[PDB]
Amino acid sequence: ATIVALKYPGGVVMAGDRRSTQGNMISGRDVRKVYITDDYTATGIAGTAAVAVEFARLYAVELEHYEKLEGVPLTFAGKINRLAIMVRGNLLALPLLAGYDIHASDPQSAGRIVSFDAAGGWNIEEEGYQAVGSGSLFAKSSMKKLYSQVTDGDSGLRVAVEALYDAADDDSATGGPDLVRGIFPTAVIIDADGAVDVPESRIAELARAIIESRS
Amino acid sequence: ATIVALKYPGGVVMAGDRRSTQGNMISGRDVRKVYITDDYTATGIAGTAAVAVEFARLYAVELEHYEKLEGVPLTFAGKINRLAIMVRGNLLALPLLAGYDIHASDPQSAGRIVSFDAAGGWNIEEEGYQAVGSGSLFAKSSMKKLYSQVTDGDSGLRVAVEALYDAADDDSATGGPDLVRGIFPTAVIIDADGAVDVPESRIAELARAIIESRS
Amino acid sequence: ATIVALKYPGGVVMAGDRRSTQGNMISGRDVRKVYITDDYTATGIAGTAAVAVEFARLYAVELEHYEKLEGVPLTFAGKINRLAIMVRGNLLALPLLAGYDIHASDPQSAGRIVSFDAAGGWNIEEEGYQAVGSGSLFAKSSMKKLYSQVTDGDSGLRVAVEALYDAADDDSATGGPDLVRGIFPTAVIIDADGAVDVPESRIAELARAIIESRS
Amino acid sequence: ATIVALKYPGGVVMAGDRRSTQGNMISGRDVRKVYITDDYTATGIAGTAAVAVEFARLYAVELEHYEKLEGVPLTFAGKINRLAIMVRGNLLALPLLAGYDIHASDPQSAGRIVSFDAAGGWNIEEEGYQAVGSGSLFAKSSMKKLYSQVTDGDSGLRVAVEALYDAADDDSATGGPDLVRGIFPTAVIIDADGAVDVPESRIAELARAIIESRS
Amino acid sequence: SPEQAMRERSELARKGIARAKSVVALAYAGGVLFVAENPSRSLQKISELYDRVGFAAAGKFNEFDNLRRGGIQFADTRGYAYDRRDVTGRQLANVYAQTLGTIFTEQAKPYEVELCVAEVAHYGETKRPELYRITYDGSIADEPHFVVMGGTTEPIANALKESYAENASLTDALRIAVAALRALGVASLEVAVLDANRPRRAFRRITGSALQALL
Amino acid sequence: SPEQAMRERSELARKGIARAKSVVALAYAGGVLFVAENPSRSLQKISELYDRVGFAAAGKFNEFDNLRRGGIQFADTRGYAYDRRDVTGRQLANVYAQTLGTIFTEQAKPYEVELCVAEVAHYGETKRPELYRITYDGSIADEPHFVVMGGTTEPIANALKESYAENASLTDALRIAVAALRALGVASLEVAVLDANRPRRAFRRITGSALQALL
Amino acid sequence: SPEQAMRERSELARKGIARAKSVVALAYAGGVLFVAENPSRSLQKISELYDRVGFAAAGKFNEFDNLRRGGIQFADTRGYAYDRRDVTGRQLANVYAQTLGTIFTEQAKPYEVELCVAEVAHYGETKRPELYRITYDGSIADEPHFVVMGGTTEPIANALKESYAENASLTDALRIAVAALRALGVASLEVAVLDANRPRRAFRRITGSALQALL
Amino acid sequence: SPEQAMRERSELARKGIARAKSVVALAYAGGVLFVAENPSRSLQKISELYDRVGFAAAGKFNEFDNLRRGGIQFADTRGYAYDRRDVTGRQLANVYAQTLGTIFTEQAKPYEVELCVAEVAHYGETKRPELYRITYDGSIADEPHFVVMGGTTEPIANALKESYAENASLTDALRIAVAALRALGVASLEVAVLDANRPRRAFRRITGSALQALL
Amino acid sequence: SPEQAMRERSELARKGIARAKSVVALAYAGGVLFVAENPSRSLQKISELYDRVGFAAAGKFNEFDNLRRGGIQFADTRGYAYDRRDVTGRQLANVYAQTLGTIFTEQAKPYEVELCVAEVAHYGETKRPELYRITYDGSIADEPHFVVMGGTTEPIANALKESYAENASLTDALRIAVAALRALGVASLEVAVLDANRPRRAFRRITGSALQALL
């Protein structure tokens, strides 16, 4: 499994693969690993569907509990602090966080990426892209060369899909586009208007274009 | 032991074998591993009769306690949540859940199959069939080829019995049809009218027809 | 040690050997391993006399406590449930339970045999006979051939004594009839009129007849 | 160390050796290992003097506490039950119990011997003699041949002293009669009139007669 | 002066109970009939405790709702502990009486509730229905025919003592109960029965066009 | 002023006891006869505590039911601890007296109950029956012939003091007790005996055509 | 004299409640309308409990703020435990009634608060809105049309009983509620609605130029 | 006003004690003589605490039975802790005084009991007997000659002050005590002595033909 | 009679508060101005709670010092838990109100203190200052302009209602507050401000020649 997040002017994009395996045997085919936990925040865990969905549900419940109790949503700094408490208490796969900062001075530079290390410490990415999972190295090396082509949301989505394809090309634990069954990776786009899921047809067309170009 | 569940238009079927062994010695001959725990829900545990019957009794008691306390049966989403709490608390063999969703928009697509992994996480099957146990691989590989012939309840029952026969053919821990003693696998069918046990004569006739065809 | 129980029309019989050893040295000669714990229930533990007698005393005290508190004896289903709680709490040798169901629809099919596995799960025997202990395999293999001759209480007692003799013939930890000291196995018969101990002279005559036939 | 107890018509006798060692070095020469804990009960522990005397003191205190609280001495069945609780709580050397049953129907068959196994379970001897300790096997094998000569208290005392001599003859951890220092084994006789200690001169004369006969 | 306090508490409880509406229970041929005046659909005074045990109460809703929940929990625990046949109306009545007595004695303010427990025979068995009445101070009584609770019960008691026949029909009993209560259409009425002809669960609620047709 | 409070509590307890029905116990040749007026079959005032110990009470059912259950539990624990012969009527009477005194002293409201404990000799033994009376404040008395509790006991006490003979028959004692109580057919009467001729369990309940034949 | 204390506590609670301002709830076509007089922006008497559950209170702010927080916590816990559809207005009303009754009974000073709980149908479903009223002593009532709490409620109750129409509009209902309350511009007024047309979260707050435009 | 409460408690204790029977203790040549009026054989007011310590009490049986049991337990614990010679009458008297004072001070109702503790010299030693009197409020006094407790003690005190001689005989002392108590055959009398000539246990009970012969 | 106790406690609290000196708070253009009469330099009634939260109190020093310390600890804990922007004046006012209400209700003697909490906008933000007043019984109010506590507050309240202007200067506000308080040099005066122009910490103390220059 591999989850990739990269920043573009005016927002941030997130995507993940759809494969879960027990060693050398394929366990699932349409595993969803990216979820929307808030109006301006999405999370992703590289692992089984159950762990990721439980983590997303717990984070959403915590955020909504604070929101209902105090009547105001938490600041982005406070959102990261609560997430790290949950990660430390659990310990395991580590989560990836991407969101939008609506209180930032510059709207064009408001997208954020947060990563947690093995020890549970959180770091804020400054290179504009981050990948986690087994194929994280290949995806990051691909984004290193492909990040110069990102200028808007569509370019960022294309680059993320290409990074996922490159990661799946070199890792057997990551699944590539399934053009026989029709199962493509899921993506989430967060901007000033909020976090929205990308429709499967645009994902499908981008994957088909990348596959045709690679031939 | 092997428990197989597959979906057909308008319902779902479940079946299991009748063998329990201590290594290389046969312990039981008529072990029952599928039980009805609710009006629209059945469960199955691959193991000894005592563990399966205790699990079914506990699940039924929990469901009935909630039903009597609140006056309304739990939703299907809430039924899975309570079951996962019981599985996590115990840890071991893992259960298989099949039921009918009466609140689904499409009645023809209401059958559900739920599986729990080793870590205790629950997953909802989308391929239409699932098998657990020692002979799960052979049964799943058989259903992979035989699923194109399922169009109603009787076809699904035939395919499930054939999958059990194929699983028993390659695994020594799974028992096949006993035409000398007269012990055949047990099956449960759940539809819009509720969960009902299949009579032993229809099981017997299907097993006899499959055996004759294989000769 | 070996304890054998087999069903006959209208009741059930139980018997056990009279040997206890510490490895290769004989410890006791007249060990009693079958006890009557209720009007319609007897139990047997393959092991030392102290453990078996303490288990029987505890079970009898529990049954009598419930009987005096509620004024009605427990059902057969409830009797097994309480016994399994005692077995699980202790953990070891495993007990064997035989009794009569007076609430059964068919009086001729009312005898019951209950066995507990290593994990502590209870199972109800359906093959009509069951043996536990070190020589259980030989006794069961003997009853497999000798069960066709059981038609009443006396036939069942003869078959049980023959099974004990066959088990002692192949196992050094099980004692056979002592025709020099005069120590023969103990037996218990449970029928509609209740559980009664078999007198030692009928045991002695059956053992002598079997020994003479074997010569 | 070895403690031997054997039954004679109308009572029971108990005796023990007077040696305690730390491996291959002799530690004590006049160790007492048999004590009177009640009017009709004596006990013996094969080991150091301190452990045996503490055990006897604790048992006597418990018996006297019950006697003073309820005003009536415990039954023989109740005396064994309390002793087993003390043995189980401690865990080690195991005790030997001999006493007289004044409520028995037959006064001539009232002597009792109780033995505790390694697991702590108590057994009632029916062969008429019992020996515990390191030289228990030799003493028991001697009593096996010498038990036919027991007809009264004096015969039983002679046989017990001979058994102790035979046990000491083959075991280096058991001490024989000391005809230089004048230290002979201690004996206790329990009959209908109560438990009494045997004077050292009768012990001495019996030991001297046995030694002379063996020459 | 405990007498003054007891009289004041009894007067307060009687005043609290007398302001509540009237609920009546009848024993017809097929079981037990419960009739109550319930203008609110959301709040109910008649519920189910176990398979063959019913519940009815009059007074403050919050005070008897907790008692009903506790009784349901106790019945479920006792059924899972021993067996499903263990739970009877006597045990629930006794525990309710003890709880009410303890509340009356220790708590500052007594409960202003009246409790009725009805039981029916199991499927395929013949046994007269049992009705119990629990009064606020813990008093327990057995009523062979009918129980009237809440409000001015004397006129209804006389109206039910007159023109009452055993082994009546459901419709005849319903009309008799309605006429007695009036001394009232689909709305402001709650009707529940305990049908002894049901296999396992005897409780059944009549509401809607069925009640009007029966009326 | 403790005197005023003590007098008020005593008056309240006497008023509560005097409203209850009368239960009488007689000591005939074969044991102890218990006669009480019980219009309800479900509720009973006479029960069994141990093998040779009976129980009888008058007053509020819930108050003495708990005492009976506690006495049964205490008797069972003491029997399992030391021996079955340890439990006697004296210990149960003493513990009941201590419990009643503690309830009278510390609890807000005294128990309005009267307790009677009867014991019989063991099988094959000769000993006069013992009767004890426990009064609500903890007072204990020994009654050689008969105990009368509940209601206006003076006329019944005089009627029993006159025309009372030792070593009478069961029928004669039953008629004498019935005549004394009247100063009453199968219904509204509860009769139990403690038969000393029984091997182990002396308690026996007479109900039905047998009671009418005896009457 | 519990009656005097109860009357004094009730009088104190009524005096405390009657000094507070009036808050009214209306059930229009699109949901539930809440109107209250709130001169302070910082303090609010109308809040949200769950997706389709509202909250309104009158009295001391600190007393009902804690109740609101506890209700929110309980709703969140129950939603995370079973499912999001488990939480309903009935459970919150019941737990609030139990809490208020316990406060009234045990605490030194009763709470001078009035509680209202309103629920609306889920998205894409048809169901009439439910309104509940909880009174300080734990009394619970169901109001089909409107609930008026705080202050002299009689004139407002009459003004709302007259000129009230079902299935009205938001503006018409707002004007009716304002006229009833007067019998009041953007300031010193708090308006919240439960919009059933919302997908998941029905609570919505109207404040600012929107309220003036609606007015 | 602690003085009023203390006087009322003292008056209540004196009234309770004065209704009890009289028990007297005498110090003759061979030890201490205890005489009491005990019409019941089952209940006893004179018991044994240790080897050379006696016990006597007057008043409510349940109140001093617990004190006797506690004293026996304390004496046994102290004897097992340090030595058998550690326990003396002084320590028991002191602990009884502390217990009685604590009961009088803290408990709601004082104990209506009178305590006497007598000690005798050890075997082969010369020492005058010691008598102690403990009064309900914890007061302790030393009586050189005799102690009279219970009932109208003044006439008996004068009758014992007159015609009392030291170093008298058992028979003479018994007659003197009986004559003093009368100011009375085998029945309704309890006699116990503390014989200093006994080796270890000095307590001895005289009952039956021996008492009549002594009288 | 809770009303009498409540009135007496309120009168005691009012009498205690009215003897204290007067402290006043003003909201000028740059923040919040605190003026108090403090003849002791060591003791202070104005302190700091968080970055933008102030504190002022009147009454017994020891009673509000503990409240100030608890508020500081709570603010620090909440800031370290979620974020520094989480802490606001509303939460501190609410927790102070709950604490004061609990002290008034449960504690024997109410606190004779008056509390004021003032908050200012963050750096680079525009928002009107907020002032809260907490009264001894837990009552909370919002004051838009000024808060006057301690002593005869009516003349100062009128003097501040007259001649008060918004957006005034520090010097003008200081003179107005001093004139209102007089209706007073460097000594016996304590002045603190909450400067909104400060980056992080807004609290500032004016003492010494600066205060004289401002005056």
From Swiss-Prot, chains A, B, C, D:
Lineage top rank: taxon: Bacteria
Catalyzed reaction equations: Cleavage of peptide bonds with very broad specificity
Summary of subunit composition and partner proteins: The 20S proteasome core is composed of 14 alpha and 14 beta subunits that assemble into four stacked heptameric rings, resulting in a barrel-shaped structure. The two inner rings, each composed of seven catalytic beta subunits, are sandwiched by two outer rings, each composed of seven alpha subunits. The catalytic chamber with the active sites is on the inside of the barrel. Has a gated structure, the ends of the cylinder being occluded by the N-termini of the alpha-subunits. Is capped by the proteasome-associated ATPase, ARC (Mpa).
Active site residues per record: A1
Pathway linked to the protein: Protein degradation; proteasomal Pup-dependent pathway
Biological process annotations from GO: modification-dependent protein catabolic process; proteasomal protein catabolic process; proteasome-mediated ubiquitin-dependent protein catabolic process; proteolysis involved in protein catabolic process; symbiont-mediated perturbation of host defenses
Industrial and biotechnological uses noted in the record: In the course of search for new antibiotics, a class of oxathiazol-2-one compounds has been identified that selectively inhibits the M.tuberculosis proteasome over the human proteasome and that kills non-replicating M.tuberculosis.
UniProt PTM comment: The unprocessed form of PrcB is phosphorylated by PknA. Processing of PrcB is greatly retarded in the presence of H(2)O(2).
Species of provenance: Mycobacterium tuberculosis (strain ATCC 25618 / H37Rv)
Name this polypeptide is given: Proteasome subunit beta
Family: Belongs to the peptidase T1B family.
Site (Covalent link with the inhibitor MLN-273): A1
Coiled-coil region: none
Knockout mutant characteristics: Cells lacking the core proteasome prcBA subunits exhibit reduced growth and persistence in mice. They are also attenuated in interferon-gamma-deficient mice. They also display increased sensitivity to reactive nitrogen intermediates (RNI) and increased resistance to oxidative stress.
Annotated Gene Ontology cellular component terms: cytoplasm; extracellular region; plasma membrane; proteasome core complex, beta-subunit complex
Record GO terms (molecular function): threonine-type endopeptidase activity; zymogen binding
Swiss-Prot record, chains E, F, G, H, I:
UniProt modification remark: Phosphorylation enhances proteolytic activity of the proteasome.
Modification Phosphothreonine occurs at: T77, T171
GO cellular component terms given for this protein: cytoplasm; peptidoglycan-based cell wall; plasma membrane; proteasome core complex, alpha-subunit complex
Subcellular location: Cytoplasm
Domain of life: Bacteria
Signal peptide: none
Pathway where it operates: Protein degradation; proteasomal Pup-dependent pathway
PANTHER family according to UniProt: PROTEASOME SUBUNIT ALPHA/BETA
Further remarks about this protein from its record: Was identified as a high-confidence drug target.
Protein family membership: Belongs to the peptidase T1A family.
Alphabetical list of HAMAP family matching this protein: Proteasome_A_B (MF_00289_B)
Protein name in the entry: Proteasome subunit alpha
Native source organism of the sequence: Mycobacterium tuberculosis (strain ATCC 25618 / H37Rv)
Gene name per UniProt: prcA
